[PDB]
Structure formats: structure tokens, C-alpha cells
Amino acid sequence: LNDPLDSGRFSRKQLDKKYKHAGDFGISDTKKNRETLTKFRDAIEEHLSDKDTVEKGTYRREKGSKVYFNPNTMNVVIIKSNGEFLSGWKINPDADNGRIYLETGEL
Amino acid sequence: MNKMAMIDLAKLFLASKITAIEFSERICVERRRLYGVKDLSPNILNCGEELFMAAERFEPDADRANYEIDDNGLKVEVRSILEKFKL
């Protein structure tokens, strides 16, 4: 019987590995536990479900992945070809990596 | 605001004073801290972004994806990144 956080596009394991990015999604909690991992999971879903969030580019190393970008928060969430959540973070428009993504969709 | 924070982190990592895991987590804290901080050298800014992305590819588990790297690989990349930016 899987963990309560294992459902839909998520797994507790993946959320734990990527909690380091939770701060980019409005979660300043420094502690990493079930409660904060849940906040992170909810924040990712909120990003994906936002009407202003749209598909934009890919994370090439993860073949067939689709990235979902929000111009307001500047956050991106990477979804594997199978639909599972991979990672996410805030795009910095002032950096060459950020500009390359905005101009070409290559993350 | 220590504008060299991310670079100092990388140096602590190359000297093995902090682990790959510690580095990969702290780099996110420092990056977030310097995000949007005007009056920041582009050389230092972009160096940090590349360090940030190098860390994103790090995975300690032996079953990591073929495109992911272990701590030894992260060490090689971090050094390569600093040299690239001459930092």
C-alpha cells in the first residue's frame, strides 16, 4: 500500500528529492516533512492547473518531456513523457539560460 | 549580500568540506537569495545558473537516469564550470 503522497503525477519520493525547489513556489518552510511535502505537492498542482500556465518547451535530457510555464511567477514544471512530475523551478530572465528558454523553449 | 555565495559554495564542495547532497540543496537556497539582485556581475550570475543546473542533474542513487550524474561527476562539472567563468 503506497504512501498517501503517491497518486496522480506524484510520488512522495520524487517530491522529497525536489523539495529544494519548493521555495520557488511560495513555500518558505525550511523543514522537510509530510506537511511541507504536501504543501509542495499542492503548489505544483496549483501551478499546473493555473489558467495562465501553458505548455512551453522541453527538458531535452528527459526525452519527450513537456515543460509547463507561467509568465507571472516565471516558474516551470517539467513533466515526463509518461505524465509524471519530474521537477520545477523559477526561470531567471536575466541569465543566458533563462533567455535561451524564453526564446527557444529549451530548458 | 555576499554576491559570491554560490561560488563559495562550489569551492566548499570541490574541497569536499560539504557533500554533493548538501551542495545541491544549499545552491538552491543561495540562488533564490540572489535572484533578481541588481548590481550583480553577469559572469557571476551565469556561473551560478550553470552550477544550479549541474546540481539538478545530480542523483545519489545508483539507479539514476542515464543522463544524471553521481557526486564524482558533479565534482568534475563544478570544476569545469568555475574554470569556464574563470572563477
Q: Which of B24, B33, B35, B85 is the mutation pick for testing A, counting most A CBs within 10 A?
A: B35
DSSP per position, A19-80? GGGGGGGT------SHHHHHHHHHHHHHHHH-TT-EE--B-TTSTT-EEEE-TTT-EEEEE-
Give ∠ CA A88-B21-B33 in degrees, rounded to 5: 55
- Distance from C-alpha of B73 to C-alpha of B23, rounded to nearest angstrom: 13
Which residues of chain B does A17 touch, with a Cβ-Cβ cutoff of 8 Å?
59
Number of independent structural domains in chain A: 1
Answer yes or no: do B56 and A87 touch at CB < 8 A.
yes
Which residues of chain A does B35 touch, with a Cβ-Cβ cutoff of 8 Å?
90, 92
Domain that holds residue A20: 1-107
- CA-to-CA dists, residue A76 to A35, A70, B61, angstroms: 23, 7, 25
Helix H or strand E segment including A86: strand A85-90
Fold of B1-87: Four Helix Bundle (Hemerythrin (Met), subunit A) (1.20.120)
Which residues of chain B does A94 touch, with a Cβ-Cβ cutoff of 8 Å?
36, 45
Within 10 angstroms of residue B33's Cβ, the number of other Cβ atoms is 13
Domain at A60, CATH number: 3.10.450.200
Cell numbers describing residue A22: 519548493
**What 3-state DSSP class applies to B15?**
coil
Helix H or strand E segment including B9: helix B5-14
Within 10 angstroms of residue A9's Cβ, the number of other Cβ atoms is 17
Q: What is the CA radius of gyration of chain A?
A: 14
Answer yes or no: do B67 and A62 touch at CB < 8 A.
yes
Residue A92, chain B, CB below 8 Å: the answer is: yes
Residue whose entry in the numeric block shows the C-alpha cell 550570475: B45
The domain spans of chain B are: 1-87
Give ∠ CA B8-B9-B14 in degrees, rounded to 5: 95
- CA-to-CA dists, residue B57 to A67, A79, B3, angstroms: 16, 15, 24
Indicate if the alpha-carbon torsion angle A34, A5, A15, A92 is positive or negative: negative
